Structure formats: structure tokens, C-alpha cells
Amino acid sequence: SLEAIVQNASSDNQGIQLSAVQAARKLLSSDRNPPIDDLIKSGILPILVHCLERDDNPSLQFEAAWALTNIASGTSEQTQAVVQSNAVPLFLRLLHSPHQNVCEQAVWALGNIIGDGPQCRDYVISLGVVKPLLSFISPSIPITFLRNVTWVMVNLCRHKDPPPPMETIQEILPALCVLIHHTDVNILVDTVWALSYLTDAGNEQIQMVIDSGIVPHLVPLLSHQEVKVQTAALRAVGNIVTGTDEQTQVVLNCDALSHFPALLTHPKEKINKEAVWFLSNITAGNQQQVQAVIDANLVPMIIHLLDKGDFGTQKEAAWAISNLTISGRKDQVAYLIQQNVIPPFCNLLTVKDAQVVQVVLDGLSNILKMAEDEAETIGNLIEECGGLEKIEQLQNHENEDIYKLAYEIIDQFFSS
Amino acid sequence: EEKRKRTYETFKS
Amino acid sequence: EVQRKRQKLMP
């Protein structure tokens, strides 16, 4: 039979029913863009939801669950079709089945529901998903299944508004301390993206991640073999160093900076860009943190990327330099000058982007003020690489911020 | 006290 | 970067 298997799936004969449900799974899983809307319109939803509760026929449960999984892998209203069929408690009950494949499909389906939004994530949590989900983690587990569990964990960690419940985050984090030591690449990428989501959620959640003791296992992943592990780890620790200076200092005490030269010379250019982002957040800190940036020999590399990189990376280098001019000491800005930052920093003054030209003007302004005893020779080294001319031209700019700053810098330091 | 550090979402236009 | 919803693909 071909279409009206809506009928066959409501048969006394469990073979007919199972074949029809397997056919519904066939329609919903063979192709590229499954016809979810016709399936929902056809009224096979309540039938498949009933199938979920059939403890006597696990194959029927599995087929129904994978049909519904693919329905809830679709649009927001498509996921709500499954939810409002009121099947989430049924999947939760299937989590306790003695059949691995039924558990796997229940976990998969719940993961698709949780991944829809903060509302559905909180709903699925509220019916008690996390403790059974986390019990599956065992040294005696199939890996194809462990990956699905870690995926669902990532979905539990997402959607900043409102962030996931504090109870649930501190329930998850011990599981992540176990999973971050695993050898599979997929497991680590998902684990570290879970951490990235949490640390992006806010300073309290950052403090939970710090308090879990997992940061010393996270930082060394920055120089891991695989690039996906590296990018996700860089994202997580960058999010952490977005917080307070003491949180940032936890990251630095895990010797995080020793990993970055490799990141600053990595051929992939987004990695350079994000590594200099990280560094810009570090130079925004206190004097000892600027000194850690300096002592890691990252100052010449940042100036190098400022000089020769593309626009995207030069922007981040410019933030790093300006934030160091804001945050630094006598000898620190002096070391920066000894590393010959002035010419490339000035050449960015002519850029299409207003924010970045303003940033370099701010940095220059603070550098002239910073060393008032070299203020004459600093003005000369600026004028040497054509910086005076570009500043006088930005005095002719259409943005109030830019020309007012250019006029202000020309007034204080250029007696000429 | 201006924008001290720079959050990840800010690091996109 | 990991995709939030994921459909199950036939072997």
C-alpha cells in the first residue's frame, strides 16, 4: 500500500501497523526535505504518540520515535506539533527502556525539542530529563550513542535568554569534567561547545564553570591536534576572559598565553582574528595581565598582525594596542614603543570603518599623553610615517567624534 | 568607565 | 556552531 497508511497504522495486526509506521519513518528520513507538513496534516501524529507507549513492541516504539524525531527536526511550529501532541513525557519514559535503540531515539527526539528554544529547553528540564540523560554516560556505552547524549547536553546549555537553570548547569558540569578527557573528536567538540555556551551565558555561569575545576583541562585544548577542538576551546576561554579580572586571571594562571603564538601564526585567518580578540580582552585588564601579554612575547606578533594582516585581523590588533595604551604602565608602553608599533598603528587612520579609526586616534592620544617627556620625539615619530598628515585629514571628517578628536590631538601636542 | 572588555556578540557588525 | 536541531539520516 502507498499513501493512506494513516489507515494501516491503526490496524489490529501489529505487523501491518509496524510496517505502516516504518513507512512513515521512510517518508520522513530518506530524503533531503521531508514533507513534514503533509504528515502532520494527515493525522498520523496521535497514532505515533500512542506508539511511543507500546512497551510490548519495542520496534514499533523505535519507528514511531524516529518518525516523530524527524517531525520535530523541522520548523518551530513543526516541533510544537510534536510537543502539543504531548509526547515529551512519553520520550522521558522511554529513556528508561531496556532497549538501547529506544533510549537513543528518545534522547535524539528530546534533543531536537530542547534545541528549539529556551522555552522548550526549560519545559523539558522541568519534567526531569537531566538526571536520566546524564546516567547514560558510562565506560560501557556505544560511541554512536554517547555522541547523541553529548549533543543533547549542548542543547541543554544553549539560549542565553533566559539562560538554563543554575541547578541544571551545576548538574551538567561534572558530566563535562568526565567527557572532556575522552579521545573521540566529536565528543570533545560537543563538550567544549557546551562550555562555550555556558561561559557566554554570563559572569555567574562563568564562575560556575571556573568552580567546576574544568578550566585547567580546557586551556590545554587550545593547542590540540584538531582544528575544531581548537576553535571551540578558543571560543570558550575567550568568553571566560570576557568577565572580571580575577576570572580572567584564572585563565591566565592555567598558562593560557603559551598556546597563543601558534594561534597567531595559524594559517586559518579567523583563528588569528579570534586569538587577537582574546588578547584584546587580556590587555583590557590590570597591569600584571598586560605584563603577562608582554612576557609571553606576544607584543611583536600582535604588531606584526597589525601591520601585514587583512582588515579583519588588523581591527583586532588595533583594539589590543589601544586597550594596552589605556591599561598600561610607564615601562609597558615603553616596551611597546621599543617594539616599533607606531608606523603600522598610524597607517590604519585611513580606513573605511569609523570605529577603528576612532580606536587608533584614542590610542595615539593616550600614547602622546603617556610619555610627555618624549612627547616632542613621539610627535616627530608620528609625523615621520605620515601620521600627522592623516590626522589633519581626519580633522576633515564627517563624523563629530573623529574630527573633534583629531582637532583635540593636534591642539595639545603640535606646537610646530 | 567605558566598555571595558568586548563581548563576543559585539565582535560582529 | 553545532546545529541545534538534527534529522536522522537513513543508512
Residue numbers in the entry:
A (entry chain A): 72 to 487
B (entry chain E): 291 to 303
C (entry chain B): 433 to 443
Authors' account:
The best importin α3 crystals diffracted to 2.10 Å for the p50-NLS complex and 2.85 Å with p65/p50-NLS peptides. Interestingly, adding both p65- and p50-NLS peptides to importin α3 and α1 resulted in strong electron density for the p65-NLS peptide at the minor site, with the p50-NLS firmly occupying the major NLS-site. In the importin α3 co-crystal structure with the p65- and p50-NLSs, the eleven residue p65-NLS can be divided into two stretches, with the N-terminal residues 301KRKRT305 adopting an extended conformation and the C-terminal residues 306YETFKS311 folding into an α-helix. The residues 303KRTYE307 occupy the P1′-P5′ positions, including the helical conformation contributing to a salt bridge between p65-NLS Glu307 and importin α3 Lys231 within the Arm 4 coiled region. In contrast, in complex with importin α3, the P2′ position is occupied by Arg304, with Thr305, Tyr306, and Glu307 at the P3′-P5′ positions, respectively. We compared the structures of importin α3 crystallized with different p50- and p65-NLS peptides and found importin α3 adopts a significantly different conformation when the p65-NLS is bound at the minor NLS-box. Similarly, DynDom revealed a shear movement within Arm 7 residues 337–338 only in the importin α3 structure with p65-/p50-NLSs. This shear movement, described as a movement along the plane of an interface, exposes an additional ~93 Å surface area and shifts the C-terminal Arm 10 by ~3.5 Å compared to the apo importin α3 structure. The two chains in the asymmetric unit are nearly identical (RMSD = 1.14 Å), but the dimer is likely a crystallographic artifact due to the high concentration used for crystallization. Both importin α3 molecules in the asymmetric unit are bound to the p50- and p65-NLS peptides, which occupy identical binding sites and have similar structures.
Nuclear translocation of the p50/p65 heterodimer is essential for NF-κB signaling. Upon activation, p50/p65 is translocated into the nucleus by the adapter importin α3 and the receptor importin β. In the classical pathway, importin α binds to importin β through its N-terminal Importin-β binding (IBB) domain8,9 and to NLS-cargos through its C-terminal 10 stacked Armadillo motifs (Arms) that collectively form an Arm-core. Importin α possesses two NLS binding pockets located along the concave Arm-core surface: an N-terminal ‘major site’ and C-terminal ‘minor site’ between Arms 2–4 and 6–8, respectively.
